[PDB]
Subunit: 33 residues, 3 copies
């Protein structure tokens, strides 16, 4: 259970580079310049 | 605390349906890749 | 290990108010309620 918590935080840290690229894709389509 | 980490990670995971609806509403208004 | 798990949950909580500010910047770039 501790490793399978750690693996599912890591998948947290990884989705959170992906969304934190997606938000700055979208804001920079919405013309923030 | 491990279970009240697991359920309150699961509640992390449940948002990633809603955010990944909203990011793909927005980018797909923007007509986009 | 568990305390430094709990701190990186708390960072879950901080990013999931931050992203839910970013999505509501994006709505107010979309002209939207």
């Amino acid at each position: 259970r501790m490793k399978x918590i750690e693996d599912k935080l890591e998948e947290x840290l990884s989705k959170x580079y992906h969304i934190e690229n997606e938000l700055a894709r979208i804001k920079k389509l919405l013309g923030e310049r």
